Design an enzyme around this catalytic site. Sequence first.
Site, PDB file in Angstrom:
ATOM      1  N   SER A 145       0.826  -1.117  -0.013  1.00 44.51           N
ATOM      2  CA  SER A 145       0.124  -0.182   0.175  1.00 44.51           C
ATOM      3  C   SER A 145       0.844   1.434  -0.084  1.00 44.51           C
ATOM      4  CB  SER A 145      -1.015  -0.242   1.069  1.00 44.51           C
ATOM      5  OG  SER A 145      -1.867  -1.314   1.054  1.00 44.51           O
ATOM      6  N   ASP A 241      -8.101  -2.616  -7.347  1.00 41.50           N
ATOM      7  CA  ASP A 241      -7.559  -2.400  -5.772  1.00 41.50           C
ATOM      8  C   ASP A 241      -8.666  -1.676  -5.172  1.00 41.50           C
ATOM      9  OD1 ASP A 241      -5.020  -2.323  -4.075  1.00 41.50           O
ATOM     10  OD2 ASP A 241      -5.910  -0.553  -4.007  1.00 41.50           O
ATOM     11  N   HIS A 288      -6.981  -5.906  -1.522  1.00 38.67           N
ATOM     12  CA  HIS A 288      -5.896  -5.002  -1.419  1.00 38.67           C
ATOM     13  C   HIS A 288      -5.076  -5.577  -0.492  1.00 38.67           C
ATOM     14  CE1 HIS A 288      -4.517  -0.919  -0.576  1.00 38.67           C
ATOM     15  NE2 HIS A 288      -4.732  -0.661   0.501  1.00 38.67           N
TER      16      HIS A 288
HETATM   17  C1  LIG Z   1      -1.951   8.952  -4.103  1.00 43.13           C
HETATM   18  C2  LIG Z   1      -0.731   7.974  -3.928  1.00 43.13           C
HETATM   19  C3  LIG Z   1      -0.389   7.351  -5.220  1.00 43.13           C
HETATM   20  C4  LIG Z   1       0.493   8.551  -3.075  1.00 43.13           C
HETATM   21  C5  LIG Z   1      -1.429   6.937  -2.873  1.00 43.13           C
HETATM   22  C6  LIG Z   1      -2.625   6.341  -3.293  1.00 43.13           C
HETATM   23  C7  LIG Z   1      -3.303   5.687  -2.398  1.00 43.13           C
HETATM   24  C8  LIG Z   1      -2.577   5.158  -1.246  1.00 43.13           C
HETATM   25  C9  LIG Z   1      -3.037   4.121  -0.160  1.00 43.13           C
HETATM   26  N1  LIG Z   1      -4.212   3.544  -0.461  1.00 43.13           N
HETATM   27  O1  LIG Z   1      -4.555   2.498   0.652  1.00 43.13           O
HETATM   28  C10 LIG Z   1      -3.328   2.601   1.326  1.00 43.13           C
HETATM   29  C11 LIG Z   1      -2.831   2.109   2.394  1.00 43.13           C
HETATM   30  O2  LIG Z   1      -1.914   2.291   2.987  1.00 43.13           O
HETATM   31  N2  LIG Z   1      -3.698   0.620   2.992  1.00 43.13           N
HETATM   32  N3  LIG Z   1      -3.456   0.295   4.245  1.00 43.13           N
HETATM   33  N4  LIG Z   1      -2.494   3.830   0.593  1.00 43.13           N
HETATM   34  C12 LIG Z   1      -1.233   5.547  -0.856  1.00 43.13           C
HETATM   35  C13 LIG Z   1      -0.491   6.591  -2.000  1.00 43.13           C
END
Ligand SMILES: CC(C)(C)c1ccc(-c2noc(C(=O)NN)n2)cc1
Length: 342
Positions: A145, A241, A288
């Site tokens: 993630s 995802d 995910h």
């Molecule tokens: C916008 C960007 C690409 C930096 C980003 C988008 C989604 C996540 C993200 N979506 O889910 C999670 C997570 O850390 N879940 N445990 N991070 C992280 C970065």
Amino acid sequence: DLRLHLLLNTSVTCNDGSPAGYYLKESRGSRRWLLFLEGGWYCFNRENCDSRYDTMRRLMSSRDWPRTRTGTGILSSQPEENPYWWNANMVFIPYCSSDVWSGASSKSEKNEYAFMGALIIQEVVRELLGRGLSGAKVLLLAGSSAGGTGVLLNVDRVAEQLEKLGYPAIQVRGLADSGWFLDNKQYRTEAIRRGIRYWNGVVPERCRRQFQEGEEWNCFFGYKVYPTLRSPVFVVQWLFDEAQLTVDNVHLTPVQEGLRLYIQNLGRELRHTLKDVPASFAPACLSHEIIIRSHWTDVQVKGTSLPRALHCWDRSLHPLKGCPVHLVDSCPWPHCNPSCPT
Ligand SMILES: CC(C)(C)c1ccc(-c2noc(C(=O)NN)n2)cc1
Ligand SMILES: *[C@@H]1O[C@H](CO)[C@@H](O)[C@H](O)[C@H]1NC(C)=O
């Protein structure tokens, strides 16, 4: 179990100024080192970081961290759970900087929080060199993630760090799980632009030179930063995802034509971005993360599991008959692959 070590350099801190750290299980009969970056979203201004501090404090502070953690999935030391790297030296780096592992800013009279994710990785690597990493043959920087995006942002810097410290024989590689996002239109980029400013966020140099000042947010998107990287990187990404769908404002809870087309187009776009990624595993599932889940061995693409694909990747870095490394589903709807998590 992996045992906690708080960083000896206590100036490298979690958001609240407490020391960052890492959990380690050594394997003295191995020259393979797996350094895993935890995920957990991010925060991008004072108000949203304050909220995260109240109810997600372990992601902002080491004050309450346990002395040990159990390695699971790719961090398991049992061959039955981890066919790939069960005998490796295992490192879990907790995510306590809320900056997608990009920050290089300390807490001060001007900064309520420290955002030091990029420096945490560097300091962990430095301190591990004195604990056996100096003898490594392979350092696999992995993450899920936000940690998967963190791999993309930091793998080449780890490689440069080891070169500059005088360790050119250590092969640095990346494994980015569930960190490959699309800056697409929502069903119904700015947060990262603001975050980078708030964090003093840093991105890999070649990508920075392409996009230039004010546009470094582009380097947080895997399909834009990946072609700029020199280290080998294996990309794991569900085609549908859940975090991508969440940011896209899709909540599957009766799917009519507009949403059907939206979801199908998302999978096709993700598949397209992986076409020229030779080491990748991208199943057609709505899910995910995968790599630290205990049942990570179950999903297969074209009959090949992820632990197998990673083993084939290792062999390729010494095509291979019956040992593929590019595994992207072509079927167009979540769970069209029967091995998806249920
Ligand atoms: C916008 C960007 C690409 C930096 C980003 C988008 C989604 C996540 C993200 N979506 O889910 C999670 C997570 O850390 N879940 N445990 N991070 C992280 C970065
Ligand atoms: C501790 O880390 C900071 C930030 O990376 C660095 O500037 C400083 O030199 C380090 N201290 C020591 C003693 O290495």
